[PDB]
Scaffold this motif. Structure first.
Motif, PDB file in Angstrom:
ATOM      1  N   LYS A   8       0.823  -1.204   0.000  1.00  0.00           N
ATOM      2  CA  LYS A   8       0.000   0.000   0.000  1.00  0.00           C
ATOM      3  C   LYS A   8       0.860   1.257   0.000  1.00  0.00           C
ATOM      4  O   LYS A   8       0.599   2.201  -0.755  1.00  0.00           O
ATOM      5  CB  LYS A   8      -0.935  -0.008   1.205  1.00  0.00           C
ATOM      6  CG  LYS A   8      -1.561   1.344   1.511  1.00  0.00           C
ATOM      7  CD  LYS A   8      -2.781   1.257   2.432  1.00  0.00           C
ATOM      8  CE  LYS A   8      -2.778   0.039   3.353  1.00  0.00           C
ATOM      9  NZ  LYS A   8      -1.531  -0.088   4.168  1.00  0.00           N
ATOM     10  N   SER A  11       1.195   3.845  -2.983  1.00  0.00           N
ATOM     11  CA  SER A  11       0.869   5.247  -2.748  1.00  0.00           C
ATOM     12  C   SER A  11       1.863   6.173  -3.433  1.00  0.00           C
ATOM     13  O   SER A  11       1.471   7.176  -4.039  1.00  0.00           O
ATOM     14  CB  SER A  11       0.831   5.524  -1.246  1.00  0.00           C
ATOM     15  OG  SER A  11       0.072   6.681  -0.964  1.00  0.00           O
ATOM     16  N   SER A  12       3.154   5.855  -3.345  1.00  0.00           N
ATOM     17  CA  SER A  12       4.166   6.705  -3.961  1.00  0.00           C
ATOM     18  C   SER A  12       4.120   6.625  -5.481  1.00  0.00           C
ATOM     19  O   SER A  12       4.248   7.647  -6.163  1.00  0.00           O
ATOM     20  CB  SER A  12       5.553   6.321  -3.449  1.00  0.00           C
ATOM     21  OG  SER A  12       6.501   7.330  -3.741  1.00  0.00           O
ATOM     22  N   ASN A  44       1.577   8.623  -7.505  1.00  0.00           N
ATOM     23  CA  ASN A  44       1.811  10.060  -7.532  1.00  0.00           C
ATOM     24  C   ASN A  44       2.869  10.468  -8.545  1.00  0.00           C
ATOM     25  O   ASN A  44       3.252  11.643  -8.579  1.00  0.00           O
ATOM     26  CB  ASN A  44       2.212  10.553  -6.141  1.00  0.00           C
ATOM     27  CG  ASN A  44       1.085  11.264  -5.429  1.00  0.00           C
ATOM     28  OD1 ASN A  44      -0.090  11.008  -5.692  1.00  0.00           O
ATOM     29  ND2 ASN A  44       1.435  12.167  -4.521  1.00  0.00           N
TER      30      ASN A  44
END
Lengths: 51, 58
Positions: free
Chosen positions: A42, A46-47, A50
């Motif tokens: 997760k 998440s990184s 982006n």
């Protein structure tokens, strides 16, 4: 990465306190595979989302 | 909307030989005072819980 330049005093008369042992993360991962994998995937996802 | 469709389960229950089924209606008034305080923070925390899925943050 650009190399760091140390002062000549630090080279001749420099000391560092460091613990060079490496602790294995296997006891956490092996006992808890679903929990460890979910946490790391997760955060990694998440990184990347982006970018 | 359509009153018959939205209230259809109740309309069927109130006209039925089966007596196990019951209709319970609740109306809440002056719950803003209850909305004050703890449960507002609970809503805030529920919203905050989604920040763990998004990397950049302060």
């Amino acid at each position: 990465y650009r190399p760091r330049r140390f002062k000549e005093i630090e080279h001749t008369h420099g000391y560092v306190y460091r613990e060079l042992n490496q602790g294995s993360l296997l006891p956490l991962v092996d006992a808890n595979l679903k929990e460890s994998s979910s946490y790391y995937f997760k955060k990694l996802m998440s990184s990347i989302s982006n970018v | 909307a359509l009153p018959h469709d939205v209230m259809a389960p109740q309309l069927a229950v109130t006209s039925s030989d089966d007596v196990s089924k019951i209709c319970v209606a609740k109306d809440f008034g002056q719950f803003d005072t209850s909305q004050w305080g703890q449960i507002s923070k609970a809503h805030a925390d529920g919203v905050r819980s989604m920040k763990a899925h998004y990397s950049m943050g302060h």
